[model samples]
Target: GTSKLKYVLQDARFFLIKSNNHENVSLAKAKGVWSTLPVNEKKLNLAFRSARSVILIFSVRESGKFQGFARLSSESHHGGSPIHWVLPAKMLGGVFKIDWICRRELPFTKSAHLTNPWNEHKPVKIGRDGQEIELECGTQLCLLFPPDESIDLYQVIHKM
Candidate 1:
């Protein structure tokens, strides 16, 4: 369901997701589309909406279905700055429970919302120069190139 769900080449059997169920487990289980596992947070390659600002996620199924619901969860963007995003066993997305721990104050931008967000699955795109990041439709997201980080669910403020 996400880049956080895909990579981590070596330790496929060693992973953790403290935020929710299903994915907190391990890939000692599914044998399909997912590339590897989230054993090491450093190797868990992810596409950020903003360099360190806007984080978002929408999902899908292996059959090309766009019901793309994901089990999104992660820690603070501070310190080691690691993020954990886990889409559950079923391809169903979940709802927000109003977590105060994630009080956002960085301002909001809707300029990147997709007209047909569900029509396409891959939202976080790597840039043409092999650096930076982009949204699915080519909206420039953020990144100060500071350092590393935590498990942060793609927080969807609003959708088009």
Candidate 2:
């Protein structure tokens, strides 16, 4: 099952679930749920985004350690994979925090390595500042990696 991580593009950002923000997490689907829609752009239902019914991790962070994963992003599912969390399901049985995500960070992995799509910028830094990379859980990441968000050097292209 984890063999899939090897082929994953590794372009995703990292979000931390701290021990203070959220109260707890549950690994179970909501006992009962239904939905209506404001749909566009994706077959994705608002239901797909709800934490009540499905979760990628019961608690992304626990005791200052990154726990396990339960689900992937919408894009990953678009790959035609049988959407699932790479690791075992965990219980959100206690106080857990869901931290804001970093746009340029990533969780660690030894099964495979991350390569920047292009030899651009710093591409990636394994761990620095106060961020961390768990040897067993792959790696952790940060935003922009150098406090630098200078897009001034880059140009945007609008196909329209």
Candidate 3:
């Protein structure tokens, strides 16, 4: 008998946070703020905070063109959302980086846009040095595009 492997892809809300430090306390605080609010609130907040994770794209400076990322995760599952590494510090090696802190929520959809109808105000950026980015606790995030040829897919897939 031949069995077909069918992978059903679910739509998840991903919040992108950026930061430099890898301390536990700092990470906890970031998650705390995220968990306290509704999804709409978090999305609006992301625009202003120092991101919990960072994304880096290296080109002319490196021997070859490359891209990278970094982030921190939470220890307590009940405390808040578990953090995943978009890019670890070891990978960055002291270079300019950008992070996309992600928060996954239920109820999959097919749209690729981030919609926050509950929140009236625009997203706010938090943290010093422009590192901690804020996201709504329960925002519904959709993949901008179906991932096919990049490691960055982890940024969207690993949440499951």
Candidate 4:
């Protein structure tokens, strides 16, 4: 079973969300978006190496409507961006998918936390609209770790 103990970075997932619609749109649609974007890759790798699995989180727009959403991964980034990251093919096996749920009103007093692979934590309190929240990859990973730490099944768990 120790062989399974070997640290693998593939299990680490990272996400980022911007509060401002304009910023979100820009980043989402940016050229070479995934590779060059500021995400905590270092922290993500650390989390993955330490645990069997990791789930990252990111949110754009605190409490407002949005046109659409998108998800990208290292696979897609390799295909799209000029920069290439050498990830193990077996470990890198995953698809990035996004689903749009029904429009539910977001709580006004809710506080958003962004974590990345780099272990950065950014706590944001959303009191009004039009405020842009940046959830880089490292920060997203940090946000996802706390709640799931109690679970023994995996190193990280994400509930969407």
Residue 135 lDDT (model 1): 39
Comparing 2 with 3 on TM-score, the higher-scoring candidate is: 2
Candidate order by decreasing TM-score: 4, 2, 3, 1
Q: Sort all candidates by lDDT, best to worst.
A: 4, 3, 2, 1
What TM-score fits each model? 0.21, 0.25, 0.22, 0.28
lDDT of 1 at 144: 14
| Candidate models: Cα lDDT each | 0.23, 0.24, 0.26, 0.31
- Model 1: residue 134 alpha-carbon error in angstroms: 2.3
Q: Candidate 1, residues 29-120: lDDT per residue as tens digits?
A: 12111222232222223421212222222112221211111221332132221224364422222212111111211211332332223224
Tell me the deviation in Å of residue 134 in model 3.
13
Give one digit per residue, the lDDT tens place, for model 2 in 1-160: 2222322213322222222222222222221111111121122233235322122221234233223332222321122222233332222111111221111223333212433322232222222221212222322222112222322211111100
Q: How many clashing pairs per prediction, in order?
A: 19, 12, 45, 20
Q: 89 in model 3: Cα distance from truth in Å?
A: 13
Between candidates 3 and 4, name the one with more favorable TM-score.
4
Residues 1-160, model 4: lDDT tens digits: 2121122223433333434434534443433232222234343434334533333223445434232222232232234333233321323322222222111222323324332223333333322221222334333323322232222323212321
Weakest 10 consecutive residues, lDDT, candidate 4? Answer: 99-108
Candidate with more favorable, higher lDDT: 1 or 2 = 2
Number of the top lDDT candidate: 4
Question: Candidate 1: worst 10 consecutive residues by lDDT?
Answer: 8-17
